[PDB]
Structure 1
Amino acid sequence: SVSKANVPKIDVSPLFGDDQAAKMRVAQQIDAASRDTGFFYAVNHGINVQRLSQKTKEFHMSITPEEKWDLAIRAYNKEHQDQVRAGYYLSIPGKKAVESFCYLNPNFTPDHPRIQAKTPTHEVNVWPDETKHPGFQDFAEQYYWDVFGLSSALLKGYALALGKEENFFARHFKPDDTLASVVLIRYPYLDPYPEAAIKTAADGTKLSFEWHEDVSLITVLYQSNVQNLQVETAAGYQDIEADDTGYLINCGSYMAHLTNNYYKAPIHRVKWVNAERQSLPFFVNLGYDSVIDPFDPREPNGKSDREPLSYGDYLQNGLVSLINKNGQT
């Protein structure tokens, strides 16, 4: 008595090519999914997810407490005042089970103009010692570009779905300046599992992370094959099936803003499961000054009474608000 949500599997391979009629047939599927539950699995994506999972497991199981403090974001280590987003997010044994590592655009180097200007939401990534984690930084940086490619293709499908030219979103999603992030999250098996680390929903469901809409344009997520996510629907919360061969895709609240809620940002939550598993989201964020004029695909003239919002303003407000609502992660 918690039924499964309709989450279609869509073959996105035409989005990488030049068959325009085939791309329109993919765009139709994206439209349908975005108007129903808001979630779909992208299949035939070209990314080696098994390897991704293996490399990530090797990192999570070998990092030590010393390394974690040395990489910690400022919420856990006061000496690291520049690390708001990038770094290690520690667990608190007996109180908080989850732990994670976040990194941003590898092009945000010490000489990048936005780093020199000290613009909010831009940081230089921190990495563990190469001899303790051979090949990890290089793997993680190449993964960023692999998922960036998949995301650009997906944004082509969303633009066509909405009646726009294929580069409508993608032209604002650029290697030199995207604020996109990867998060490598570890959810542990624990015996006993501390009650303090388990939250409870109004409907009685045990949770690891409460209800929310994503802070993103779209979210491109790989998870282990253990069911955990739920989406709010007409008929209550419904289970999203796991599939550790595909990427789970949904719209974030910036997409909802731009489309006047034609494509809603679905409300979803993370169930508590006592299992050792991985959750590896890529948050598709645009540039700091990117602005798309809002429109409404349900209106004849397509006009909307929403005002333009720059991406940088959206993102900094969003990330802080999500911490205030659902806690530091």
Structure 2
Amino acid sequence: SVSKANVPKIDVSPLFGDDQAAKMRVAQQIDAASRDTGFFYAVNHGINVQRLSQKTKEFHMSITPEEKWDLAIRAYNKEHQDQVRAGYYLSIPGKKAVESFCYLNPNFTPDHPRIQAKTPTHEVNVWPDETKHPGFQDFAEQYYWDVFGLSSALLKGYALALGKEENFFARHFKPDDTLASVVLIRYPYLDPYPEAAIKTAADGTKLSFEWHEDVSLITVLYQSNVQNLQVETAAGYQDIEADDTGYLINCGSYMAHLTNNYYKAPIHRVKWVNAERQSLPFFVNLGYDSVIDPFDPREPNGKSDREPLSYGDYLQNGLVSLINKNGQT
């Protein structure tokens, strides 16, 4: 068998308030989890995840092939050269099971200075027709802001955990400019399940998505109640229990860079499961020009031999690299 990873449940509600000592006690738990397997569940987060899941299902099960082409990113539709990030990521029956819809900051409108400048990694979201998907765009944009709020609270906990003031990350995480994304991923039930859409790990485990570190500062993930994630530890890959009431939190490789690997970006992978399920990550990305000077909380003077990296540079290069490593999703 495979052993269960230690993934503690942390009540993050104090991070929304003004009880400083309580917030430090949360920060301690985040530091412990970040130093151990790298994962925890955030509980008492305030978001209505059941409704998220229901609205997302209604979308995934009603969108049609026609709409998917019309919304498709460039990798699927050459007419959409501006859609590198945002839009529909199609399945390929018989070959590729997963499909998804990605959207960015709702404030990236046509008049946004970064959109006007055509700055990489900034795009205007694309949406289905309102009459075919009533309420969906409004729901989804509101979700963005709900999960942005949660992520800002979590960032105050990570900051305190690392010995910094609580706005150390959050001051770079701002509504007008964040590069954060929501991805609404559908993993289908298929009978028969084509083997070409199943990858095999070196240990024999059947996978839907291969080992990786996340391209994020942190990742704030809702998933259905179907076990599938595994984390590499010193003792090997361990299963992450599902919990469709909490958000699964981990660091991405920007956090690893900024902390000199004190908070590692944990390596993880997605087991193949023949189950209709959802995976709804929010990738907590900063602004394009955000730079945090790297540091090391294990060294007395806090100094690091890493060089500063702008978030936009990080992001543009990370997203390409992960496509090259593990394939276009």
Shorter-chain TM-score range: over 0.9
* Distance in 2 of aligned mates of 1:299 and 1:229: 33
Which residue of structure 2 aligns with residue 302 of structure 1?
A: 302
* Distance in 2 of aligned mates of 1:14 and 1:52: 23
1:51-95 Cα shifts (integer Å, max 9, x gaps): 000000000000000000000000000000000000000000000
Which residue of structure 2 aligns with residue 55 of structure 1?
A: 55
Shift of 1:279: 0.2
* Distance in 2 of aligned mates of 1:178 and 1:15: 20
Runs of at least 5 residues in structure 1 that lack an aligned partner in the other structure: none
Report the secondary structure of 2:288's partner residue: coil
* Distance in 2 of aligned mates of 1:127 and 1:113: 21
1:106-152 Cα shifts (integer Å, max 9, x gaps): 00000000000000000000000000000000000000000000000
Shift of 1:49: 0.2
Shift of 1:292: 0.2
1:247-277 Cα shifts (integer Å, max 9, x gaps): 0000000000000000000000000000000
Report the secondary structure of 1:222's partner residue: strand
Report the secondary structure of 1:45's partner residue: coil
* Distance in 2 of aligned mates of 1:295 and 1:187: 38
* Distance in 1 of aligned mates of 2:54 and 2:267: 30
Which residue of structure 1 aligns with residue 107 of structure 2?
A: 107
* Distance in 2 of aligned mates of 1:199 and 1:300: 45
State how 1:275-286 maps to structure 2 within 5 Å.
275-286=275-286
* Distance in 2 of aligned mates of 1:271 and 1:15: 32
Report the secondary structure of 2:146's partner residue: helix
Shift of 1:231: 0.2
* Distance in 2 of aligned mates of 1:89 and 1:286: 23
State how 1:245-264 maps to structure 2 within 5 Å.
245-264=245-264
* Distance in 1 of aligned mates of 2:128 and 2:65: 12
Shift of 1:234: 1.0
Shift of 1:222: 0.1
Shift of 1:40: 0.1
Shift of 1:193: 0.3
* Distance in 2 of aligned mates of 1:97 and 1:82: 25
Shift of 1:235: 1.1
Report the secondary structure of 1:306's partner residue: coil
Verify: 1:119 aligned to 2:104, yes or no.
no
Report the secondary structure of 2:18's partner residue: coil
Shift of 1:17: 0.2
* Distance in 1 of aligned mates of 2:299 and 2:278: 42
* Distance in 1 of aligned mates of 2:312 and 2:135: 32
Report the secondary structure of 1:221's partner residue: strand
Report the secondary structure of 1:302's partner residue: coil
TM-score, normalised to structure 2's length? 1.00
* Distance in 1 of aligned mates of 2:256 and 2:235: 22
- What number of residue pairs does the alignment pair up? 329
1:198-236 Cα shifts (integer Å, max 9, x gaps): 000000000000000000000000000000000001111
Structure 1 outlier segments of 4+, above 4 Å: none
* Distance in 1 of aligned mates of 2:103 and 2:258: 27
* Distance in 2 of aligned mates of 1:259 and 1:181: 23
* Distance in 1 of aligned mates of 2:61 and 2:304: 49
1:5-46 Cα shifts (integer Å, max 9, x gaps): 000000000000000000000000000000000000000000
* Distance in 1 of aligned mates of 2:173 and 2:64: 35
* Distance in 2 of aligned mates of 1:234 and 1:315: 28
* Distance in 1 of aligned mates of 2:35 and 2:114: 37
* Distance in 1 of aligned mates of 2:196 and 2:182: 27
Report the secondary structure of 1:204's partner residue: coil
Report the secondary structure of 1:300's partner residue: coil
Runs of at least 5 residues in structure 2 that lack an aligned partner in the other structure: none
Report the secondary structure of 2:107's partner residue: coil
* Distance in 2 of aligned mates of 1:299 and 1:97: 46
Shift of 1:295: 0.3
Report the secondary structure of 1:211's partner residue: strand
* Distance in 2 of aligned mates of 1:254 and 1:213: 10
TM-score, normalised to structure 1's length? 1.00
